[PDB]
Design a protein around this ligand. Sequence first.
Ligand SMILES: *[C@@H]1O[C@H](CO)[C@@H](O[C@@H]2O[C@H](CO)[C@@H](O[C@@H]3O[C@H](CO)[C@@H](O)[C@H](O)[C@@H]3O)[C@H](O)[C@H]2NC(C)=O)[C@H](O)[C@H]1NC(C)=O
Length: 418
Amino acid sequence: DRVYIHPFHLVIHNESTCKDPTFIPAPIQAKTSPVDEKALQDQLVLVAAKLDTEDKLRAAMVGMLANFLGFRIYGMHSELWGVVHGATVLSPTAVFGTLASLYLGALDHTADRLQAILGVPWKDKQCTSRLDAHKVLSALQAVQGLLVAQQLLLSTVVGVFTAPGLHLKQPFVQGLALYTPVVLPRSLDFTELDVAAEKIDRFMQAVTGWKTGSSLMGASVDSTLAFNTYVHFQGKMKGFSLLAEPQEFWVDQSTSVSVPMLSGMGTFQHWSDIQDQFSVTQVPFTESASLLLIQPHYASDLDKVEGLTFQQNSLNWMKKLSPRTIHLTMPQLVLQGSYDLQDLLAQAELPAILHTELNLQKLSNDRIRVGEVLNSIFFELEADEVLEVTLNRPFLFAVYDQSATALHFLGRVANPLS
Ligand SMILES: *[C@@H]1O[C@H](CO)[C@@H](O[C@@H]2O[C@H](CO)[C@@H](O[C@@H]3O[C@H](CO)[C@@H](O)[C@H](O)[C@@H]3O)[C@H](O)[C@H]2NC(C)=O)[C@H](O)[C@H]1NC(C)=O
């Protein structure tokens, strides 16, 4: 039958769609080849170039769902950036994919309560009403390719670290492959969290080359699973050059810091909301991919303007933009941060879903006790009459792809270096 309770008809099971091999992941110290990002990129544009009409529509639908979940997380936090360690950056698509990956191996209420957080309700307990995890995970990889299909590099890596002797069901890892080709299941002993974390740090650093440095803070010794998602972004600025001399960045009224600055001159979409007092600048990476820069007219209104950024009307002022001849000067961004979804979605009772009456039996029939659910981000901006736009004070930024209507990152820059 036709769906009415929600317009997300392409993410649920259809009529047709709606004794398992296992294995121990090799020990983490087992030498593994590094990630060939260049090869990964080619696979992602291929995925996007050969999409069917329906799959292309489902990709935009997931990007829209990921945006809504991001807006929810901000509304349920008195202080959002106290949970994030390192750079204050957030990836709605990665958070949505991490939960969709947990929902892949969930059952019964655990799967329903996860489907609720993802933002798709049900009017009954029919199989059809539930989410099709395969279609969701496959659609996320589509928006990854739709971003780099057109200067841009996006690499998503998943690390499933299990306890020694824990059997992971083959079909589960086979489902994660729909999300990203780079799935890294490895077995790790959780009886020494201090060294167990150091094994992951060097393992991920050797495999990827990116530092993450997560010491398994929220994890305990009885834990048996560490589901981590690592994303790396690298964007080239159209016609921007790195200035040899730094400039001052005012973290507050009293103190400033010298920082490397990017300078560029081009016709950019711009808008200044007078009532709320903030300006929005758009620097395109491609035609459908661009960088949104939100600067409050006065630094004291940062938290306020951010409240208007993390909402659905933020996408309404993509129309209010207008072409302008602008000379933009902003800091060089090489950011690294991380955050646990259990802390992000604490007010949504995610820690209660992952620790009480847990049912991840499609992931593994062995007993599971979540140590951490991590999102590690490595964000980079690189170089190649008039309204001067200078970001010499805290500001907000966002990356948006029109092809999939997806917000890949939402960040805050209070200090370019830390
Ligand atoms: C419900 O959604 C599922 C998506 O999982 C659809 O499954 C896919 O259906 C197509 C049919 O158009 C299958 O293609 C066929 O594959 C066989 C090989 O087995 C080939 O010989 C046929 O010529 C055709 O290409 C596709 O394999 C199948 N994929 C999966 C994963 O099941 C299903 O069709 C949808 N049903 C409805 C009623 O919308």
